[PDB]
């Protein structure tokens, strides 16, 4: 089981699921090998009905796609319609919660306020919208009105992405036409440029992808804005993670997805119901994170993660997890099914993200607290019928420091500096004390040991003294593998990145450090990296491609991660992939991802799926940048 | 050859194409076979990096995708893309003209200007914007303004929709929540649902391209009605059709993609610039049409029609192509490489569709016939590089009489009954003497003999009185094999339909009859057929699944073709489509398809690839039809 997750309450469930006779996403993976490998290699078009067309990696004919369509055009194809998805989800979820926001301010939605009345005032500032003399809920309707408006053209290019770089990249990017002019504009032109008989030259399409890129980054940091008004910006946060964070005498709630609109409320409410669960002879409610819904109350609430992305079937598997509620976006449909053998009550939420199987609650926000009460008492009616029955939890959980929002790590750094809190970390990089910065983002992939590029990769930098931030399903590894637990500082971190953490940590009080690795929360919450990484730009007067920060997402998966590693590209950052991209099929579309582009936008993609190796490259990126900054390395 | 094309004319280019060692899309297709089964029934997914996923047809594992997805929601998911895809160019489409149009009424582009008043009128009535009292440039913005308006989430659903079905169509889609939002947004929306672990329902996920669909219709209407207020609405008009229209003495210059924004001015600046071609030895600048900017200078302009789809490289293959001026969509990327050996300029004008190896014009409105001259330069150079060079044009063509707007046939028909025009067509539905309707549409595919199926069903429908109207390559087809020539009627038609369009013709003063096939335009002009469709609705108190109407996508290709059929089916159609689309693994999503649809909007596919079978399949449909309005049949 070591060889399908690292985790070892994973493997222990997957005991289990064996006994059991339930198949898994492993099973599943194992069933469908060996997979093809024009569909790996990125050779295969299905975007007409002359097809399917495939080319051959290496030999003789088939050589070009029917239509004429090159390996090139099929492969750039191929990745700027993932680019175009992964924005999709992102900017959904962001749009959602502009219209969540706007019915708020609106007095439709009495369960939804402005409960971050700095950032809603900073947001307005950064955007140009006025805030003296005027009310809370006018200033919120014009953000919220600015933020719909990023999604179709106007006589601006998007607010959010223009609004959050700096000049200087913001200019580079202009030049070569890059800057979006709305999101879903742009991921309709990459729908049409794509489709039969449109664009066809691989360096056009992929420039279209970056753009779309820059879009999908929109929503992100759209979204991360926009949940930190409504529910709160993070600030540090003591909590645990992993499946022992399940309780058997509890009503077991896991939140699932990322739009956490209607997730928030059900963690108020759940406190609220804590006698009528009681009542049917349980302790309480006990709420428990999956995935990036997990991330967002995690980093607001310290409620604790249950478990991530591959291994998010094993929770259920436990035969405690009374109740899965999903929003979207990275739910393995299966869990429907495996809730039959298992006894959990999945319900879904949202619209368009139904699960066949499961039992549909049409959220609404004007009934949100009572969407969450029908929704707790599915979950106590499933506990009460558990009653009597053995569960396997396994009793293994880590401890966990998160909510390092930027805003949450410019105040801990200004305890060392009170006017000037980016120049301690800029001191530290100068003096070697910080190497440079790695960015862990992204998925799990059943093709990769459940977490083992993360752990690998995240080990090898810290030895060498690079400050790691993660989001996502990166954070998700790095905390059920110890590292968001200070006292795992003196066995992983190197003595000047020790040093520093317990420079700051005494400085904020703590008696001891911040922990190995900086949780920066969900997936859209890669964009809070951003701003951190922009505001080290503007503090140096220099681009972000010549800061010595990388990205590595290590174990990607989802077409979200595809268009994350590709803006991180786009804004300058050498950015690892862990797993293979659909694009080894040509060879110009890899040289251009990898090595031309860094002529364009100063960052490039890194891919390479042994970890030790890929450290040595990230670490070599992060010299190189060192060195051109004139620094010792 | 005759295996590969009906044409004579593509049979002649293919002989001299292999002599010639030239590589044709034929060829392309013999190489890519056998093709994927996985593919062709829809059971694979690339929708993240675990896969490829597939799923046998038949037999032993794999049988669910890595995630859990199963068939049902991998077919459905595939299918959605495509329509969302389709939905994407013919909005794109769409979107550009109304930009143009905006330049054009601020005095930003004098090439460009209201060229009809009274379509412009008529248009802001429909859409409730006001008219008396205000400028035609006024009235013109709010038009392009309220076009733009339709891609995004606003106070009202889509104008493009809800203003040119019936209120009773309108209600029915609106009960099942398939009127869409905005354009854009629902292509996003399909992107995000479709990702991975999202929607996985195939009823959510079908309602969700159902919807998606009628934004594709949106884009369409919205299409052709900024082209008709820009360039004027088609009316009958006489031409030629098929590669004999090509003049060995003459510059030969195609004009093909979709978009007719440049091509149109190419018509009236060829013109101008006679006395120069002159100068070069040639008698003049002969503008010749491929695929649907070809079929929209053909309706607006009589410009005769070149070649169709699939047999686009074949106008080539006669050495005297002098240049081919590309738009997007539907152009096979061959064309830039067959460019080689023929000596033909092929010239790409939009930014997001480019060729590797064409030569790029930066086309712009403001310098329109700047871009014109000096692409129609570029032809002359080639005209004289090919001095002395035999060229083999097939001696092969056809009349075509076209121009059948739908203001054009309710005009024709007004000189049978001036103040209630639908009612002579009606009055012959009653009679028998028309049977019911069949629209024509979509591609030529190389899996099917080139114009088989449309010409085969056709007659057979011709011949049971049927009134057959067409567009896009389904028009190509029908107008190169004649059925566009009334001399043809007496052979083609019934002697029901015989005397209906005698009757018309002669009351129109031709001393003959209408053609035995009205056609009605490009693709985008689909939407006239809906115009026609919906008036005799409204004139029957009916909606448009009571009607003795159908549709045929008979030898379908693009994913544009796809979301048409998809939006026939929605709006109430019994709809053919004569090549299998990528359904076929999933017998529930085939059978909501092509049966419980019909519960929902009334309409439903008949997939049927043997075309004397859809014949009688299509006829049954249309006799159903009558039959459930009392009808005799
Ligand atoms: S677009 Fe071209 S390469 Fe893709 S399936 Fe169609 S013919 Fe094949
Ligand atoms: S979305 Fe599911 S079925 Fe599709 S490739 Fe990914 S794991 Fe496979
Ligand atoms: S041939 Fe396998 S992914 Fe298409
Ligand atoms: S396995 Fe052939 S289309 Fe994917
Ligand atoms: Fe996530
Ligand atoms: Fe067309």
């Given at each position: 089981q070591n060889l399908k997750s690292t985790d070892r309450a994973v493997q222990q469930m997957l005991d289990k699921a064996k006994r059991e006779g339930?198949?898994?996403?492993?099973?599943?993976?194992?069933?469908?090998?060996?997979?093809?490998?024009?569909?790996?290699?990125?050779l295969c078009c299905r975007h007409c009905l002359q097809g399917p067309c495939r080319i051959?990696?290496?030999?003789?004919?088939?050589?070009?796609?029917?239509?004429?369509?090159?390996?090139?055009?099929?492969?750039?194809?191929?990745?700027?319609?993932?680019?175009?998805?992964?924005?999709?989800?992102?900017?959904?979820?962001?749009?959602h919660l502009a219209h969540t926001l706007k019915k708020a301010v609106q007095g439709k939605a009495a369960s939804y306020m402005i409960k971050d009345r700095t950032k809603l005032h900073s947001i307005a500032k950064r955007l140009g919208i006025p805030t003296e003399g005027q009310k809370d809920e006018?200033?919120?309707?014009?953000?919220?009105?600015?933020?719909?408006?990023?999604?179709?053209?106007?006589?601006?290019?998007?607010?959010?992405?223009?609004?959050?770089?700096?000049?200087?990249?913001?200019?580079?990017?202009?030049?070569?036409?890059?800057?979006?002019?709305?999101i879903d504009h742009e991921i309709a032109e990459i729908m049409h440029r794509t489709s039969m008989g449109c664009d066809?030259?691989?360096?056009?399409?992929?420039?279209?992808?970056?753009?779309?890129?820059?879009?999908?980054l929109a929503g992100c940091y759209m979204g991360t804005d926009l949940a930190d008004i409504l529910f709160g910006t993070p600030a540090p946060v003591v909590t645990e993670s992993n499946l022992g964070v399940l309780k058997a005498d509890a009503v077991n709630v896991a939140v699932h997805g990322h739009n956490p609109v209607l997730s928030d409320i059900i963690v108020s409410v759940s406190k609220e119901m804590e006698n009528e669960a009681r009542?049917?002879?349980?302790?309480?409610?006990?709420?428990?994170?999956?995935?990036?819904?997990?991330?967002?109350?995690?980093?607001?609430?310290?409620?604790?993660?249950?478990?991530?992305?591959?291994?998010?079937?094993?929770?259920?598997?436990?035969?405690?997890?009374?109740?899965?509620?999903?929003?979207?976006?990275?739910?393995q449909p299966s869990v429907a099914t495996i809730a039959e053998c298992?006894?959990?009550?999945?319900?879904?939420?949202?619209?368009?993200?139904?699960?066949?199987?499961?039992?549909?609650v049409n959220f609404?926000?004007?009934?949100?607290?009572?969407?969450?009460?029908?929704?707790?008492?599915?979950?106590?009616?499933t506990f009460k019928r558990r009653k009597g029955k053995p569960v396997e939890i396994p009793n293994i959980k880590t401890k966990v420091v998160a909510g390092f929002s930027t805003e949450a790590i410019i105040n801990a750094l200004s305890k060392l500096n009170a006017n000037d809190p980016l120049?301690?970390?800029?001191?530290?990089?100068?003096?070697?004390?910080?190497?440079?910065?790695?960015?862990?983002?992204?998925?799990?992939?059943?093709?990769?040991?459940?977490?083992?590029?993360?752990?690998?990769?995240?080990?090898?930098?810290?030895?060498?003294?690079?400050?790691?931030?993660?989001?996502?399903?990166?954070?998700?590894?790095?905390?059920?593998?110890?590292?968001?637990?200070?006292?795992?500082?003196?066995?992983?971190?190197?003595?000047?990145?020790?040093?520093?953490?317990?420079?700051?940590?005494?400085?904020?009080?703590?008696?001891?450090?911040?922990?190995?690795?900086?949780?920066?929360?969900?997936?859209?919450?890669?964009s809070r990296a951003v701003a951190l990484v922009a505001a080290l730009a503007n503090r140096l007067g220099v681009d972000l491609d010549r800061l010595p920060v990388v990205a590595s997402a290590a174990e990607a998966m989802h077409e979200k991660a595809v268009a994350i590693g590709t803006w991180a590209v786009t804004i300058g950052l050498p950015t690892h992939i862990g797993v293979l991209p659909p694009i080894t099929g040509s060879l110009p579309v890899t040289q251009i991802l990898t090595s031309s582009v860094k002529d364009i936008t100063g960052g490039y993609f890194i891919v390479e799926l042994d970890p030790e190796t890929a450290a040595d490259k990230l670490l070599a990126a992060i010299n190189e940048r060192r060195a051109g900054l004139g620094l010792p390395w």
């Open positions: 339930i198949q898994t996403v492993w099973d599943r993976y194992e069933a469908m090998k060996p997979q093809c490998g024009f569909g790996e290699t990125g051959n990696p290496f030999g003789d004919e088939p050589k070009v796609g029917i239509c004429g369509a090159t390996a090139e055009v099929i492969v750039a194809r191929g990745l700027d319609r993932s680019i175009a998805a992964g924005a999709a989800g992102h900017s959904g979820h962001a749009k006018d200033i919120a309707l014009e953000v919220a009105k600015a933020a719909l408006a990023d999604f179709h053209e106007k006589d601006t290019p998007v607010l959010w992405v223009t609004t959050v770089l700096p000049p200087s990249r913001v200019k580079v990017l202009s030049a070569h036409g890059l800057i979006p002019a709305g066809a030259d691989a360096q056009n399409l992929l420039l279209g992808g970056l753009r779309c890129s820059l879009a999908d009542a049917a002879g349980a302790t309480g409610i006990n709420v428990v994170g999956i995935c990036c819904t997990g991330n967002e109350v995690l980093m607001r609430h310290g409620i604790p993660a249950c478990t991530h992305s591959v291994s998010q079937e094993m929770a259920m598997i436990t035969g405690a997890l009374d109740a899965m509620i999903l929003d979207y976006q990275c739910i298992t006894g959990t009550t999945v319900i879904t939420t949202m619209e368009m993200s139904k699960i066949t199987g499961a039992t549909h609404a926000e004007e009934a949100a607290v009572e969407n969450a009460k029908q929704i707790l008492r599915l979950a106590i009616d120049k301690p970390l800029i001191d530290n990089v100068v003096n070697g004390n910080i190497r440079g910065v790695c960015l862990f983002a992204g998925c799990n992939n059943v093709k990769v040991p459940q977490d083992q590029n993360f752990t690998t990769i995240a080990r090898k930098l810290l030895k060498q003294n690079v400050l790691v931030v993660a989001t996502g399903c990166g954070a998700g590894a790095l905390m059920r593998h110890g590292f968001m637990d200070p006292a795992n500082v003196d066995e992983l971190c190197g003595d000047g990145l020790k040093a520093v953490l317990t420079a700051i940590g005494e400085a904020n009080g703590l008696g001891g450090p911040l922990p190995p690795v900086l949780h920066m929360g969900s997936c859209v919450d890669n």
